[PDB]
Design a protein around this nucleic acid. Structure first.
Ligand SMILES: [Zn+2]
Lengths: 98, 282, 96, 168, 91, 346, 49
DNA sequence: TATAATGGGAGCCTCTGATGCA
DNA sequence: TGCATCAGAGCCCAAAA
């Protein structure tokens, strides 16, 4: 929860938050490559008794040396008034850091 | 231009056969040909025409050239050229020399001249001309794949036109198109117009282009490389330094030495092990 | 480039500098363990995190690329030992 | 062993075939729906090796220690995927094609061996003119056709097919 | 210059018009849009044999509009078209 | 020096046919095919095999090759053998051989004389992703198809029939070869329909249509989601060699990371995990280490069912689940005590 | 200049459509394809130097 | 698968060496 | 044989994008 502290319910960093290198700006999950459950990871996951999740953490993070105060967020989904994205793109998030 | 050989009974040849003087045409051997030519069997006029023409073997393309290359005895040509090296004329001795140097090259090396003509064309491993999904799920691919595709399409079409017995005009156009396609793959732009992708003026990048030039394989990746454990920043004067010293920003030094720092973080208790230490630096 | 977390380019002129200094092992690192030598760069990281010294380098992968690209041009490139016997830099993977 | 020497030499059609792990028979690259490589195409896994380590295409033999198995169903060897950087394919041409380096690099090496000029070698390779292997006693304009002589299309047809003519 | 486009079909150019921009400048920058106007052209089709005339205003797409300060908005980004010096035509 | 110009010059050396000449060649071609059928009856030989032998002798020794459909490899030995059976026919039968021979000859001339037609059709299809000469050759392929199917009795001129087949051949080539990622011909038709539809919609609406508007215009079966999916499939790849700003100094592919080969850090991590995993499995019994390897796939990579794992060790489906639990239990105990596997949980 | 190029290209499509189509039913909307024109301007603004 | 249709279309610096010419 | 003409070969680095 320390890592997610400054993310809102939807996963976007809150306006006014201070972001430093490594911090999450927008949380995102991606479905694991079809090879994914390596046999090594299967046994490791089994030892701790936690099912390996179907999705991996692809979240957008602050690059090395960057960061600042979050002054804006723009979120655009598919199926909302006025917006149509390029084919295949469900939603686009932009974060302006000052 | 034909000789006319009327026939009462059955004719032993058929239209398209090639014939030399004396070959039996029809009527059990009675009528035979006086000239060299092509047999035209007329069932209306009841006559066997032989159109005057020869069985000459003359070819076009790399097939002809490959034959002439096979028909070389390099020892013999060396002898000829050695005799030419004695001729009084300055230009004559020079020309026999240049020729003799290529011949001797093949002789010493063990290469057969006909290998300069390709029958099987190699196909580069796929990972060296990759098809990769970029960020957006979009695909980015090497130009070589299109050059190969042109080649394969034209080759397959050539196989089909041959099996279906197309006229020589069709086969010749196809064959010359096939040579150009191999040419584009190996060295594009070398001979003739550079092959381009549709709706772009950019010549496709062939194998020769990859090897040579400032951007080529030798100068870009071989005589020089991008390297790890490296960094860059703005420089500032340091009057207080001793001659053997420099100021290095700590944030730069932590990345450049990161693996060393992880091990040292293990000797001291700063992290339980190397994996935890890296996780702490993120 | 900085945006890709890139490494610095050690170019033709930089190699000359290392050559003129006679720094053969420093230069060899740039050409192998610190770039496209895959086995070498992997082994070097593991050694540094274990406190061992970095191992002797292997064939740079971009030379293998060069070899296969010359094969695509119908040229046979052969690495030989002192006896002129072939030396296989693909370690059996590309030969049947 | 230590590499002390690098030789470079011409490659025979036989040798090019000995390198090759398969013939690429189709211009196809990857399937538009599955995104997997097309069989017999430029990315085919049956030729250049498995996309994923120790896993065949259809996924019947998925693990190590099976190195060297070739799946009967999908035809892919179970080995390291690194091999897709190494294994060569080949295309078998229906007609020989000249390697342009040995044609267009002056002075031409092919041209030099056969005593053929740049123009002559061009004319044969690019189907502008015939070259005679066996005149078989042909004659054109009173003189016998000599081997390695260049004939135009009109000249060859008069020799080969005769000089017929149709007058309206 | 392009019209009339001859063969007995002949297509002639009457006049063009530029509409108003679908989105204001600020909005285009926000949405990664080009600031542009719809271009239409009034064309009359003539059949030289028949005399038949069908006339219609065809939509040719959009043309980018320059803002007040002399720049453009192309896919959301501000751009400048730099003047080019060259040899004057002549003898 | 110009491959199109050269081909055009060769095309111009074959005079165009007169209506009489055209009808004659077509007539001889039809008669020749009927003869090949008849020659098949007499001999009991494959009609196709006979046809290739007839065709072989007309084209000459120059072209002799194996034909994919022929059951026997076709080489000068076999065509001489088969030709000798044909030359063994009685006069009234042996005449059909002569008919077939003359048929192939006329086929050749008819094709050669119509080549200029293909050029005039092909020139109209440039810019669709195939080179001009490529279009000419596919068009020529259709012309060959046309010569075999032409029925001269209908009194239509040949150009009428050919044009259909030539247009068909060119359009199939464009649909088949134009894309680096090949698309089924029917799917290309739908994509092109969507283009035409969207372009029409943009011409009435004064702006590009949305996904929803195209679905309406496309009729029943089409919603906005399907228009989008169709556009995604229709995207063509972009060159890795695409230049990037600067000058002629960088390529687009140079900015694309390699996700397949492990990075030194990632490769190191996975290797260390396998070795630490084996360390823990050596602290079990041989049977309970094998049971875990078999259940989680550290062998073949697949997770075996209890029924299969039980059958390999000779125990009950419940037993292998039990030895797995004490294995994981012994494994879990060693972990809290030795803290070896903690760091790999990320 | 780029407009003029796209316009010339549009004319090629027009002339080519005035042959293969119906000599009876043709509008200016059926005769004109603006894609070549849109592309020339789009090319100039996005990719010109 | 059938009215007839039959030949394309375009363009913006210096040294060195081979090739084609009195 | 000695001179002209043309095709083909090159044209800074790193940084950035
Ligand atoms: Zn399989």
């Amino acid at each position: 929860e320390a890592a997610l502290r400054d993310l809102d319910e939807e996963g976007v960093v809150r306006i006014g938050a201070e972001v430093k290198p490594g911090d999450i700006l927008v949380g995102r999950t991606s479905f694991k490559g079809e090879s994914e459950p390596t046999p090594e990871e299967r046994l490791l996951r089994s030892i701790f008794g936690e099912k390996a999740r179907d999705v991996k953490d692809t979240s957008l993070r602050v690059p090395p040396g960057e960061g600042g105060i979050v002054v804006r967020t723009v979120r655009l989904r598919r199926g909302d008034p006025g917006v149509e994205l390029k084919p295949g793109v469900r939603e686009v998030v932009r974060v302006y850091v000052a | 231009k034909a000789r006319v050989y009327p026939f009462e009974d059955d004719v032993e040849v058929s239209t398209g056969d090639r014939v030399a003087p004396g070959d039996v045409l029809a009527d059990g051997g009675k009528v035979k040909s006086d000239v060299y030519g092509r047999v035209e069997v007329d069932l209306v006029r009841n006559v066997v025409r032989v159109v005057e023409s020869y069985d000459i073997d003359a070819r076009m393309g790399a097939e002809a050239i490959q034959q002439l290359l096979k028909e070389l005895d390099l020892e013999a040509l060396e002898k000829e050229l050695l005799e030419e090296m004695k001729h009084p004329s300055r230009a004559r001795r020079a020309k026999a020399r240049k020729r003799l140097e290529v011949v001797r090259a093949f002789l010493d090396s063990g290469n057969r001249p006909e290998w300069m003509i390709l029958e099987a064309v190699p196909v580069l491993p796929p990972d060296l001309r990759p098809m990769v999904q970029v960020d957006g799920g979009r695909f980015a691919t090497s130009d070589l794949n299109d050059l190969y595709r042109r080649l394969i399409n034209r080759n397959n079409r050539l196989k089909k036109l041959l099996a279906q017995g197309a006229p020589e005009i069709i086969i010749r156009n196809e064959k010359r198109m096939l040579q150009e396609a191999v040419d584009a793959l190996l060295d594009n732009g070398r001979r003739g117009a550079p092959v381009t992708n549709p709706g772009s003026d950019r010549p496709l990048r062939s194998l020769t282009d990859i090897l040579s030039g400032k951007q080529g394989r030798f100068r870009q990746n071989l005589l020089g490389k991008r390297v790890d454990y490296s960094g860059r920043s703005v420089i500032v004067v340091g009057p207080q330094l001793k001659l053997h010293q420099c100021g290095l920003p700590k944030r730069m030094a932590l990345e450049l030495f990161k693996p060393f720092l992880l091990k040292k973080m293990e000797e001291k208790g700063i992290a339980p092990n190397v994996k935890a230490a890296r996780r702490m630096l993120e | 480039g900085k945006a890709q977390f890139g490494g610095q380019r050690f170019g033709e002129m930089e190699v000359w500098a290392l050559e003129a200094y006679g720094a053969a092992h420093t230069l060899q690192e740039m050409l192998t363990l610190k770039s496209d030598d895959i086995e070498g760069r992997n082994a070097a990281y593991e050694a540094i995190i274990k406190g061992e010294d970095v191992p002797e380098p292997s064939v740079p992968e971009s030379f293998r690329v060069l070899v296969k690209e010359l094969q695509a041009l119908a040229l046979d490139v052969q690495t030989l030992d002192e006896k002129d016997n072939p030396v296989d830099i693909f370690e059996g993977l590309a030969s049947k | 062993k230590e590499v002390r020497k690098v030789r470079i030499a011409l490659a025979s059609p036989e040798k090019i075939r000995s390198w090759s792990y398969g013939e690429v028979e189709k211009p196809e690259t990857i399937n538009y729906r599955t995104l997997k490589p097309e069989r017999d195409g430029l990315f085919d896994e049956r030729i250049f090796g498995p996309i994923k380590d120790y896993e065949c295409a259809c996924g019947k033999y998925k693990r190590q220690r099976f190195e060297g198995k070739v799946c009967e169903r999908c035809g892919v060897e179970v080995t390291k995927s690194i091999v897709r950087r190494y294994r060569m394919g080949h295309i078998e041409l229906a007609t020989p094609a000249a390697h342009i380096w040995f044609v267009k690099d002056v002075p031409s090496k092919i041209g030099t061996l056969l005593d053929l000029s740049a123009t002559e070698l061009e004319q044969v390779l690019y189907f502008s003119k015939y070259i005679v292997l066996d005149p078989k006693g042909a004659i054109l304009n009173g003189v016998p056709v000599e081997k390695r002589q260049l004939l135009t299309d009109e000249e060859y047809r008069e020799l080969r097919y005769g000089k017929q003519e149709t007058y309206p | 210059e392009t019209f009339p486009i001859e063969e007995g079909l002949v297509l002639d150019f009457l006049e063009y018009r530029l509409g108003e921009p679908p989105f204001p400048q600020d909005e285009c920058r926000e949405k990664d849009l080009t600031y542009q106007a719809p271009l239409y052209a009034r064309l009359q089709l003539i059949h030289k044999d028949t005399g038949l005339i069908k006339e219609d205003e065809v939509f040719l797409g959009h043309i980018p509009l320059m803002t007040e300060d002399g720049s453009f908005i192309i896919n959301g980004a501000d751009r400048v078209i730099v003047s080019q010096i060259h040899r004057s035509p002549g003898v | 020096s110009d491959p199109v110009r050269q081909y055009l010059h060769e095309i111009g050396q074959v005079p165009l046919l007169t209506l009489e000449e055209e009808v004659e060649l077509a007539r001889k071609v039809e008669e020749g095919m009927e003869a090949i059928k008849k020659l098949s009856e007499i001999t009991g030989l494959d009609p196709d095999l006979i046809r290739e032998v007839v065709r072989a002798k007309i084209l000459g020794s120059a072209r002799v090759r194996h034909i994919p459909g022929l059951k026997e490899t076709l080489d000068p030995k076999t065509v001489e053998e088969i030709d000798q059976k044909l030359k063994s026919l009685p006069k009234e039968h042996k005449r059909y051989l002569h008919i077939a021979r003359e048929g192939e000859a006329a086929r050749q001339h008819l094709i050669e004389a119509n080549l200029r037609l293909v050029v005039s059709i092909a020139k109209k299809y440039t810019g669709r992703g195939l080179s001009f000469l490529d279009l000419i050759q596919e068009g020529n392929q259709g012309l060959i198809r046309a010569v075999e199917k032409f029925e001269y009795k209908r009194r239509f001129k040949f150009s009428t029939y050919a044009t259909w087949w030539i247009r068909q051949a060119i359009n199939r080539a464009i649909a088949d070869q134009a894309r680096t990622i090949r698309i089924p011909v029917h799917m290309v038709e739908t994509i092109n329909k969507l283009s035409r539809t969207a372009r029409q919609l943009q011409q009435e609406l004064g702006r590009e249509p949305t996904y929803e508007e195209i679905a309406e215009a496309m009729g029943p079966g089409w919603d906005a989601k399907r228009v989008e999916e169709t556009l995604k499939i229709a995207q063509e790849p972009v060159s890795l060699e695409t230049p990037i700003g600067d000058e002629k100094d960088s390529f687009y592919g140079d900015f694309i990371p390699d996700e397949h080969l492990p990075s030194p850090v990632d490769a190191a991590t996975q290797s260390l995990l396998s070795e630490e995993l084996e360390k823990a499995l050596s602290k079990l019994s041989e049977r309970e280490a094998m049971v875990l390897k078999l259940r989680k796939g550290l062998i073949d990579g697949r997770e075996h069912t209890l029924e299969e794992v039980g059958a390999f060790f000779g125990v009950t489906r419940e037993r292998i689940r039990q030895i797995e639990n004490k294995a994981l239990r012994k494994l879990k105990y060693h972990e809290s005590r030795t803290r070896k596997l903690r760091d790999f949980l990320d | 200049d780029q407009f003029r190029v796209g316009l010339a290209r549009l004319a090629r499509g027009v002339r080519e459509r005035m042959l293969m189509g119906s000599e009876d039913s043709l509008t200016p909307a059926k005769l004109v394809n603006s894609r070549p024109l849109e592309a020339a301007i789009r090319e100039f603004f996005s990719r010109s130097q």
